[PDB]
Amino acid sequence: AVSKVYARSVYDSRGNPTVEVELTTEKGVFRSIVPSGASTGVHEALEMRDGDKSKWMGKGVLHAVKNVNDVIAPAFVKANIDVSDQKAVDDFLISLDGTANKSKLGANAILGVSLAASRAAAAEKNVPLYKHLADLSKSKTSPYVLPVPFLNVLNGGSHAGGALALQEFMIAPTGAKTFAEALRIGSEVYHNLKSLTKKRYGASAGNVGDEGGVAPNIQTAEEALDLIVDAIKAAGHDGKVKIGLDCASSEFFKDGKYDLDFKNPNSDKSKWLTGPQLADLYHSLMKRYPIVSIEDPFAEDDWEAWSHFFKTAGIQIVADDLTVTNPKRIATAIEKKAADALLLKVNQIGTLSESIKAAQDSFAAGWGVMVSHRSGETEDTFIADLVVGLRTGQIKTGAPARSERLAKLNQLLRIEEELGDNAVFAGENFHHGDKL
């Protein structure tokens, strides 16, 4: 039974405060550290920030921590809830909040408790967390599926100087036969990319962004993709490694058109592209490079351009800003056949139960699910166990650099070793890992 619930302020990978929750039961203390989320959020669960410009530049979580300690904990303790009953945990928390976006107690306060409980239930049942999450999500467990990691290697858009408007370039070692081999190949590609980067752009270019990728000053999409192809080739893994893109197109959508030179800042509007023109540019890249996944190719509310594109895409299309892990939004996305993969961000919805339902609804529509990290990550490895528990076959948790990223990748190494013959690597079937 839960005897104590406590929260404290700790730091995320960007050096901003975040909430750490510890839940005590008869079996020990279980901890969860929440990643940073959004405090202003239409369609998303809102994390609570202090707003006191005199402390942490207005990003403290003292209120949130207060909500956990002074409000949730006494209630939670008295409710006597069975932690093995995740939905009972979550319904309890939501009910305590009473808002649609968890803006009363804060999504960061609620999520912290929701995840710690799941750790505590696994402890109780005596199984690894991933097996517990498999149970709660009703996933097949014969065998378990290890994911292809979509590794961030290079960043453009708002994350870099240069003209490049596309935000993220990832490599996915779909050709490996095991998770350990996929990670080894993926790191070799990364290191070669870093050497090529420093060689062509300067020692400066070799420094990393928040998720571990480089951000040289690149002018075009072909420039970025050529660099990546060279790195793949240099490591000797041509054919075994595919590319994934995150266009984050909402960043350059203006006046109903897409500004590919949005950093311009005298960007010629005669050159802005309509949805259809932009689709032609993607088709182009898709023909020359081994791209197998494109995230957010169109803006968050440009439904017609997604639908249009989806018709002829032929590769996985991932919804991130389109859906913001919001069930009403997902439902519409499915209905409009706007894409076929959901980027899942647990702190965007706020509870583990609601995260699992969103994945289940996706799977039921034939969609794939890509479990994702956040910009501000922590040393907590939760999403590693969650991608295995959900059997999605694909995770986006950063480059093979920066331990808030490697902590998850190292955790997948351990899980893979622990399962022995009871695990298969998703490989080329990443899109539909749930059905392997």
Interface with Zn ion, residue 251, by CB under 5 A: no
Query: Which residues, 6 or more positions from 169, have their beta carbon under 8 angstroms from its beta carbon?
Result: 152, 153, 154, 155, 156, 213, 224, 225, 228, 243, 244, 245
Cα angle 157, 246, 314 (rounded to 5 degrees) comes to 140
Interface with its own copies, residue 20, by CB under 8 A: yes
- Name the binder of 161 from Zn ion, its own copies, none, CB < 5-8 A by kind: its own copies
Structure tokens at 149: 């990691």
CA 185 – CA 243 distance, rounded (Å): 14
CA atoms within 13 A on the CB side of 372: 27
Phi then psi dihedrals of residue 396, to 5 deg? -120, 100
CA 374 – CA 404 distance, rounded (Å): 10
Q: Is residue 87 annotated as involved in ligand binding?
A: no
What is the H or E stretch that residue 5 is in? strand 4-11
Interface with its own copies, residue 277, by CB under 8 A: no
Catalytic residue among 194, 345, 354, 377: 345
Report in angstroms the alpha-carbon separations of 9 from 49, 68, 116, 182: 12, 11, 16, 35
Q: Which amino acid is residue 233, in one-letter code?
A: K
Active site residue 345: yes
Identify residues 380-419 at the interface with its own copies (CB under 8 A): 399-404, 406-407, 409-410, 413-414, 417
Q: Which of 205, 344, 359, 384 binds its own copies (CB under 8 A)?
A: 205
**Site string (303-322) toward Zn ion, x via CB under 5 A:** -----------------x--
Q: What is the DSSP code (8-state) at residue 207?
A: S
Q: What is the DSSP code (8-state) at residue 273?
A: B
Catalytic residue among 44, 47, 211, 416: 211
- Work out how close the CB of 353 gets to Zn ion at its nearest, in angstroms, rounded to a whole number: 24
Q: Is residue 375 annotated as involved in ligand binding?
A: yes
Q: Is residue 159 annotated as involved in ligand binding?
A: yes
- Name the binder of 320 from Zn ion, its own copies, none, CB < 5-8 A by kind: Zn ion
Interface with its own copies, residue 242, by CB under 8 A: no
Active site residue 211: yes
Interface with its own copies, residue 63, by CB under 8 A: no
Q: What is the DSSP code (8-state) at residue 203?
A: G
Number of neighbours of residue 104 by Cβ within 10 angstroms: 15
Q: Which stretch binds its own copies (CB under 8 A): 201-209, 252-260, 309-317, 341-349?
A: 201-209
Q: Which of 2, 5, 7, 12 binds its own copies (CB under 8 A)?
A: 12
Q: Which amino acid is residue 261, in one-letter code?
A: D
* Residue whose CB is less far from its own copies, 86 or 192: 192
Interface with its own copies, residue 264, by CB under 8 A: no
- Work out how close the CB of 418 gets to its own copies at its nearest, in angstroms, rounded to a whole number: 11
Binding residues for Mg(2+): 246, 295, 320
Catalytic residues: 211, 345
Binding residues for substrate: 159, 168, 295, 320, 372-375, 396
